[PDB]
Write a protein that binds this ligand. Structure first.
Ligand SMILES: Nc1ccn([C@@H]2O[C@H](COP(=O)(O)OP(=O)(O)OP(=O)(O)O)[C@@H](O)[C@H]2O)c(=O)n1
Ligand SMILES: Nc1ccn([C@@H]2O[C@H](COP(=O)(O)OP(=O)(O)OP(=O)(O)O)[C@@H](O)[C@H]2O)c(=O)n1
Ligand SMILES: Nc1ccn([C@@H]2O[C@H](COP(=O)(O)OP(=O)(O)OP(=O)(O)O)[C@@H](O)[C@H]2O)c(=O)n1
Ligand SMILES: Nc1ccn([C@@H]2O[C@H](COP(=O)(O)OP(=O)(O)OP(=O)(O)O)[C@@H](O)[C@H]2O)c(=O)n1
Ligand SMILES: Nc1ccn([C@@H]2O[C@H](COP(=O)(O)OP(=O)(O)OP(=O)(O)O)[C@@H](O)[C@H]2O)c(=O)n1
Lengths: 559, 559, 559
């Protein structure tokens, strides 16, 4: 079990996620069974009790664990599934030993943070990194660790001590540390001194960097490479840069041109770790696939505007897996995405009493859209606005995808306008109204992986064709409220077919609407299962409908 | 003797000189007899043995001491003259105690950096800060100290220890520390953490900041003011910012609007320090004069292009007192300066054999110039180029000022073209030629203040009118070579009058040429004696000739 | 050129000199041509301008350089001669680059402590360590460096940075660092935490210890070895202890039983450094000689009391080379030394007017003495007291040795009592008296190595027999005043033969007195040339006379 620990920096908010994930992807092109751990110095146990106003999406694993946003970046780049234990936090590990303490398992000793926490942190990393994360049951070869926070922090203190001991308990030639660092440029001069003071506080804590990765407003001068390397000892070929470039998917290609694989292959002796010719052939495949899809990102110019309809769209972090999944679809289509960020709070005509500009700006964006998407956040405040976007797409042929709250507002729109019961509602919005047509009932949330089965009369359905005509699908959920099962037989008689259901038949999970080019929704979140090199099928469909060639996409999938 | 010590930062190259000088100017508007010290952690004894390729101008005091560039900024803002002891350096203070040691003055003790250097540093600061620096013989009231380097540096180590002891040996309420700091902005967020880590290394060394001054790419958020103040303890009204604004002369006005006088008046009890009504009236005069001249800088738009002819003009730092003195002239004229940086190495027709573009670009700039200036650096390599600019100005009515090497190349041009001896030369360039017309002889440099006397037939001369028709002038020199005294009587018979001379008559120090609008030179450097609120008379003349109204300038001076 | 750098600690005053010298002796038993450098963070240039009240003896090299006491410990253990450049100091290296600066040799650059001092320190160590120090002209193999002060000190700051760079400029496997550290024991528990905090400040400065040497009130617990090694990373076999034992000459044998040679032989690859079978045979000889002489120190019990007569004998550090040379003599004689510390300020009868006890206590000690020694410090205040000890030894058969001031007071005693001129005097005490019998004249000091030649009528003389009957001797001097050459022919006619002289015959350097068992003096200091395994001949004589068997010593020398 080799380790690469990404770490460091003078500002927490600099460059670790993009680098760690890119390191993991690069090491995956060696054919190594790479795995990945996040260390979050924050106290939260798991993400379900924290709102999207901080650290973005409430991301979900096959385990059903609401987890840190940064796990999603490892899944979507590495092509792996992570267990809820691959996110380590301050309150997780303190809750762990305090649970073990009240259980009596410390045999009456005084429990001291050294060695006790620094043993729990090491034992957790050594448990977790052996867990299988691939399509096959084999244990991993190399673990990337993102140390969140900065080295030299009250809260990352037990984690840096635990890593200091771990660097000896699993030796040199089996552990390597990469430190991300700021290199400010002021008056056009690349001032190294913050990445010298931050290496005093690094070496004080006994960790030793084998690579320095810079974030800077420029490429590094040969002078500032030497000025880092002579003070903060690494070779001249072990300082690397992650400068501003318009594509995050090119950061693996920068680091490979800076020879980072050739250094880590030497520094972790990776040629001695056993691999087959098939592993090495999958390794060169992962590289050449990533080069070809980035060549498509380079030479593509034919824009496709997707309108993404929701709340808090000024905090663009709130829809990160949506945004990345749309880009995975757009790259597979060889077409340049733009996302129009559309405020559902503005589409409502009530906006026109308060500010006309917001109304017409939102409808300008929606009118411009080659496809529409209601991806669903949390809370009720924008539901009328999303019904307007569900209407516009139905009455105007515009492609549509309703994820989670998107199913519920698309069925509420269909009930309000095509069944024609003007009172029909989301029970989470309007429980006090006690309707017959409640388009929502509570069934405290169905979370993580579940099997979805298609209803037999569906060989005509494009959405099941995008899933390859298979009988069953496995995807990740978040829903407390669901479609009302009594209303289904009415909606299907109007052509709003619920193409996918739970095996019990009481819970309805996919629709596709007859005669419309492409109008779909999913009760599961298809964002979370997207991979960069193999995109999520409802999102590939939406961008393919917005692009044209949806038939050719389906034909190619059917081969 | 109160002290304000400017200090600090995470990068040496951030903001101390602009802030320290502005603090000193502001405290001068209280009517306090402000003085100023530079601490340079570099080893050089004094600047005469370091070339302009590093830290710029070889600046000169009334003492004749070649000293750090940063002394010039205190002189030109504060309106004071500094002794060569107001620049403290590592090799000055180590050479001082080692001189005292070999003299036997430590009574056979083992000389240890604590306390011995840290006593010498404190004794030097307490000697120096009492030295009179004004138009009157009174001792100073407040000393600004610029600690050069950063707190937390191998070489600023004895200086921070010496200040740590000094903060107790002259107490709180008589010493205050201002720390300059970086506040990076990354992804549009003002990341405080470098100004937290750098305050651990500050407080470790026992110093305590009473003000934090930021350099940042923006104004400070109210959030980042509170985030500094809660970690690095100062009040919310004691964090201040020195953001990018197009004028350095506005930095005193920023700091006054941020109430920095109201804090230092309280924190150094400055209301108890004895002052007269006349001192307070001079105090409000210094403020209102600085506001009115900056109002002129604000509402002025009529450009005046000065071509400054020399070498190494890509290192624009090399002519700093020239540049600032031209701006002191331009502000007094209410006219917006541009300096055309003109390469003498390009004006030469030999350039046209190597690159035509450089030639025509240099002559384009020179042709555009409302006035020309040969300010004189060091070494011979551009002398032919400067003779071409001395010719162009003479044959084309363009105003001219030849400082030091400017006199020598203007007299060499006059000898070559108006006397018409084509071989006449600078002996420093062409000593091997052994001419009769050597326009240069060695007289190892006449340095610092000397008296200049005007030749009696000079009531017609504009340059003596700009000096107020007085018999004598006191200015600062640097010259090893001078005009040949035997050639003078010939040049004067042609109308190149040497309007100013040494009292011995063998050394010729000013010329003015008959019939030309304004063609002058000075063997002394007039840059070094310029003040911001009272500009240097040859430079006020050059910008007044380039502007027009030179007669009105002379009339106003003659009142 | 391998390096071993001794360093470190939480208190400056702990254990470095005893360890460094013992390391050097041990590595000398490999047959390596070991050399040695002292780094003194104090500012003094050289020791002649510091008095014995601090850091003890004003020790002297063959170069004639008055140097730090600690050089003497390397000479007397390693059997080598050091140049005055093998002592590096803060004011030496700052005076060096400032000399190079005023000479112009930095080509006009701004001289900055990094890299400039940190290059001078590295260049000095690389010049110095190649200087031949043996009986043969070959360059050294391994350099011991004692870093004086502690790592983490304002004044040792350029030296720790210079070593940090040097550890890379001469790599790992060619440099190794040993850190001395305190391990306090409190309430009977060996508290490691000072040797953890001091290793944060070590690793912060980028140095990395390969050995930890402890000073502690006990042997180290196996628990505190593991508690150091797990925090301050070294193996369990790389923590070593230098506990209190009654003999400093056993510290090499402790460190060899703790396998320190076996670690440094591996860690510096010393088996690859080229040596002959003769070098290895001299290596095992140095070990077995040191074991046999320490076996003599172990089984010896027959006391020999030497009375050492002087000033400031409460600062026992003031006579260190005397004390060590007497022990080198005593070990060669297989006899247990005691030194009676005798106050010359008390032997004087004037003491009996102020305190009778001091008088009778001093004469009790002097009466008890098996031999007397006037070794000579500095200043005149005790000269009458030393004349009393010169008298007592002459009139009572007690063996005597007068070094430097000892010759002068023994000749002053002889002139006062055996020639019988009661006024005869030291001119340094009584210059105003203008005598005919001035027993002292100025000839500003004859320093370092000089040739001494024996007067031809000397085959009877025991002192020349102890020097092996050779015509000439080479020894180290310090004298400003000397014997008056006109008085010599009178003293010799009375049997006070000046057995040794300068080749010019005007300067008289050794005496031996007829008929007395052993009454000698030397104008040179024989202390400074003493080796542990080959003792200084006048001191071997004094302890042999005090022991008996002086004839057998002479017989054994004459083989
Ligand atoms: N492989 C990656 C890595 C990062 N990002 C983007 O970059 C942001 C996070 O940057 P990251 O590289 O993770 O650094 P930070 O999160 O700023 O800080 P850290 O060093 O702790 O990761 C996210 O909003 C994400 O959209 C991305 O799109 N793809
Ligand atoms: N002395 C301190 C201060 C803060 N933190 C940690 O800092 C983390 C936040 O990181 P970052 O955003 O990088 O620090 P901020 O204080 O927000 O500063 P900035 O404004 O630069 O983000 C928190 O988890 C907190 O535990 C720490 O370990 N030690
Ligand atoms: N009152 C001032 C101060 C600075 N400058 C300009 O700013 C530069 C120096 O900036 P300064 O404020 O002195 O900071 P630094 O020198 O960069 O660093 P330090 O903090 O050590 O001063 C000079 O080239 C000078 O032209 C100026 O014109 N007027
Ligand atoms: N550990 C160190 C390293 C450097 N210096 C000092 O740093 C000063 C140079 O300051 P600055 O330019 O701020 O440092 P640089 O090393 O040049 O780094 P940068 O590239 O950020 O300027 C020198 O006088 C040198 O004595 C120091 O005191 N301690
Ligand atoms: N080989 C040695 C070493 C030391 N000493 C004695 O120990 C004292 C000095 O101890 P040392 O080991 O040099 O440590 P310190 O000088 O206390 O401190 P440092 O670690 O700087 O050497 C001297 O007075 C000396 O008499 C000795 O006799 N023989």
């Amino acid at each position: 079990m080799k380790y690469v620990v990404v770490s460091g920096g003078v500002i927490s908010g600099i460059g670790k996620g993009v680098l760690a994930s890119s390191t993991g992807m690069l090491l995956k092109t060696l054919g190594l069974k790479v795995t990945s751990i996040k260390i979050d110095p924050y106290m939260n146990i798991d993400a379900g009790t924290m709102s999207p106003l901080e650290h973005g999406e409430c991301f979900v694993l096959d385990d059903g664990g609401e987890t840190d946003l940064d796990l999603g970046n490892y899944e979507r780049y590495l092509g792996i599934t992570l267990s809820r234990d691959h996110n380590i936090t301050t309150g997780k590990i303190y809750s762990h030993v305090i649970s073990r303490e009240r259980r009596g398992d410390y045999l009456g000793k005084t429990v001291q943070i050294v060695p006790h926490l620094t043993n729990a942190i090491q034992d957790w990393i050594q448990r977790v990194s052996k867990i299988p994360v691939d399509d096959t049951g084999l244990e991993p070869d190399v673990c990337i660790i993102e140390l969140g926070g900065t080295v030299g922090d009250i809260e990352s203190a037990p984690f840096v001590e635990a890593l200091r001991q771990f660097q000896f308990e699993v030796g040199r030639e089996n552990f390597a540390l990469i430190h991300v660092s700021l290199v400010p440029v002021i008056h056009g001069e690349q001032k190294t001194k913050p990445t010298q003071a931050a290496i005093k506080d690094l070496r004080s804590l006994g960790l030793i960097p084998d690579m320095i990765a810079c974030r800077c407003s420029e490429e590094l001068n040969r002078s500032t490479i030497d000025k880092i390397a002579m003070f903060c000892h690494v070779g001249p070929e072990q300082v690397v840069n992650v400068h501003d470039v318009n594509s995050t998917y090119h950061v693996p290609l920068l680091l490979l041109k800076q020879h980072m694989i050739d250094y880590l292959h030497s520094r972790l002796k990776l040629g001695e770790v056993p691999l087959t010719l098939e592993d090495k052939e999958r390794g060169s495949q992962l590289l050449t696939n990533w080069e070809n899809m980035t060549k498509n990102l380079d030479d593509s110019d034919d824009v496709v505007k997707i309108a993404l309809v929701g709340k808090y769209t000024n905090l663009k972090d709130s829809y990160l897996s949506v945004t990345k999944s749309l880009e995975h679809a757009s790259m597979k289509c060889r077409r340049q995405l733009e996302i129009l960020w559309v405020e559902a709070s503005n589409l409502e005509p009530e906006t026109q009493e308060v500010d006309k500009n917001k109304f017409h700006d939102s409808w300008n964006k929606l009118s411009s859209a080659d496809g529409i998407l209601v991806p669903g956040g949390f809370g009720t405040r924008g539901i009328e606005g999303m019904i307007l976007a569900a209407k516009w797409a139905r009455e105007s042929g515009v492609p549509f995808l309703g994820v989670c709250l998107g199913l519920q507002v698309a069925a509420i729109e269909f009930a309000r306008n095509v069944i024609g019961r003007p009172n029909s509602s989301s029970t989470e919005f309007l429980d006090e109204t006690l309707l017959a047509p409640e388009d929502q009932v509570v069934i405290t949330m169905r979370l993580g992986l579940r099997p979805t089965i298609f209803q037999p009369n569906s060989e005509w359905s494009n959405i099941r064709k995008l899933y390859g005509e298979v009988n069953e699908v496995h995807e990740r959920h978040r829903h407390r409220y669901e479609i009302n099962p009594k209303i289904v037989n009415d909606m299907e008689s109007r052509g709003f077919i619920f193409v996918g259901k739970d095996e019990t038949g009481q819970r309805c999970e996919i629709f596709e609407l007859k005669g419309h080019p492409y109008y779909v929704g999913t009760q599961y979140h298809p964002e979370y299962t997207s991979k960069v090199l193999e995109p999520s099928r409802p999102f590939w469909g939406l961008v393919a409908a917005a692009s044209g060639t949806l038939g050719e996409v389906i034909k190619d999938i059917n081969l």
